[PDB]
Structure formats: C-alpha cells, structure tokens
C-alpha cells in the first residue's frame, strides 16, 4: 500500500561489465582547521634556527 | 543459484480450480515477497498477487475472490490456489522476488497452464 | 485502477538505431518520492529479467544500453544502440496502488 523498502542490494556477479562492477571506494576527507594538525606525511623533521 | 519454477498442474477444465507449487530459492521466504503474474494472455502482462514479509497479501481487483496465495515459509515453497479458470487465462505463471520499490527483481521459468475442457 | 496504455504495439528498428518505447499512464503520484515506474522484459526464447527500477537506474545483468525517464504520465524507454539482445516485448509497471498491472505490451522486432 504504496511504503516502499527503503534499501535496496546491488547486482556483484564476476560476468559484469566495466559500468556494474564493484569498485571500492576510499575517500580522504582533509580538513584544515585552527587546531593543531596531528595527520602529517612522511617528510624529513629538520633542526630548528 | 535462484530457483523460482512452478509445477504441480496438468490440465484443468474451464470453472475448475487447481494447486501450483513453486520452489523457492536463493533467497529466504522471510526477506522478500514473492509475486505471482501471467505471461500474456492475449493482451499485455497481468498481475494477481504478492504476499509480504509475514503480513498480508494483495490481490489484483479481477482475481482477489477467485485467486488466492498460499505461503509456506517452513518448507521455502510458495503455494498457489485459483478458482474459476477461463480458457483465456491459459499462459505461464511465474514467481519472482521483490525488490526495494516493490519490483520483481528476479524471475523464474514457471509452467504453462492450460484451461480446456 | 491504473490502465497503463502502453504505446506503440510493436517496433520495427535497426540495429544502432534508436528504438523509443513510450507508456502512457494516469495515476498515482509520490512513487518514492516522484512518479516513476519499472520497465521489464519478457523473451520468448529465454525467462524475463528487470531491465530499469525507476524508470532511471541500471540493473545487474542486463547492458546500460537501456535508459529512459518520465513523466506523470508521459513516460519513455530508450534503447540506444539497439544490438542483438532487444528482441523481446517490453512492458512498464506501476507499483503505488493496487492492482500493479503492466502496460500492454511493446513488441519490438529488431529491423535486420
């Protein structure tokens, strides 16, 4: 009587093409705040002058 | 993988009745409802009835006082009661799952039932 | 009651063409949140699949060649190109009031 389910599942089968396959998704939300940053990269710390 | 096949009828007279038992797999009973439609009897695709999650069940306006479903969640098979058969609703009845905005996502191969005297 | 008048009864296209497959309809209205319906397929040489839910998505299974949108009533099934998969009648299907009848039925006959 028109209360649809919500959710619904996706069609994974190793014979999809390009536009149906699964592709997993990682997303590196950055953000640049006033706080002090604990997330750095692997660059060399130097001495101080 | 999904098994969605009718059987059980053989040949049934015009105002008679009759028993279809369709083999459920691939899926629990208890996640999705199973539909039940035609295969073009004459003009386009007709639907008769769906029966939900461990609820109620609805029917098509034309078939809600002859057709009826049956479910039967302990043995994973869905069971079909119709009455009052007309010779031009002779056309294979299939089964299918229900998707997320009550669609017929899967499809089985179903049985072709013939009404004749 | 919904009479989906699906038009027109049969196509004749080629293969790379464009094959338009219109359903008209008269109700309901908030699907979802909208008024759109399912399209499917029944071959005659193989069980049927759901080719579009919505009227706007893809399903698993079947190519992306299949697309379309729609109206309240003025709806639209595109299949462009038209390869040798589409041979088989296609139907639409309303499924926010019952009884969830189908459309009538377009044949389409791939225009070799």
């Known amino acids: 009587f028109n209360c649809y389910f919500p959710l619904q599942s996706y069609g994974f089968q190793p014979t999809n093409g390009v536009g149906y396959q699964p592709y997993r998704v990682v997303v590196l939300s950055f953000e640049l705040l006033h706080a002090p940053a604990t997330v750095c990269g692997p660059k060399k710390s130097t001495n101080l002058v | 993988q999904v098994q969605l096949k009718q059987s059980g009828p053989s040949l049934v007279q015009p105002s008679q009745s009759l028993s279809i038992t369709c083999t459920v797999s691939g899926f629990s009973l208890t996640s999705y409802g199973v539909h039940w439609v035609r295969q073009s009897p004459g003009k386009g695709l007709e639907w008769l009835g769906v029966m939900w999650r461990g609820g109620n069940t609805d029917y098509n306006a034309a078939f809600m006082s002859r057709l009826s479903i049956t479910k039967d969640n302990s043995k994973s098979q869905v069971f079909f009661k119709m009455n009052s058969l007309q010779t031009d609703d002779t056309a294979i009845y299939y089964c299918?799952?229900?998707?997320?905005?009550?669609?017929?996502?899967?499809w089985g191969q179903g049985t072709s039932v013939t009404v004749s005297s | 009651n919904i009479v989906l008048t699906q038009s027109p009864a049969s196509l004749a296209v080629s293969l790379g063409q464009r094959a338009t497959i219109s359903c008209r309809a008269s109700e309901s209205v908030d699907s979802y949140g909208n008024s759109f319906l399912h399209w499917y397929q029944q071959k005659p040489g193989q069980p049927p699949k759901l080719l579009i839910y919505?009227?706007?998505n893809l399903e698993s299974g079947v190519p992306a060649r299949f697309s379309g949108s729609g109206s309240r009533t003025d709806f639209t099934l595109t299949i462009d190109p038209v390869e040798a998969d589409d041979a088989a009648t296609y139907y639409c299907?309303?499924?926010?009031?019952?009884?969830?009848?189908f459309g009538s039925g377009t044949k389409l006959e791939i225009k070799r």
């Open positions: 919505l009227a706007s």
């Open positions: 299918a799952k229900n998707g997320g905005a009550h669609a017929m996502d899967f």
């Open positions: 299907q309303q499924n926010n009031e019952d009884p969830f009848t």
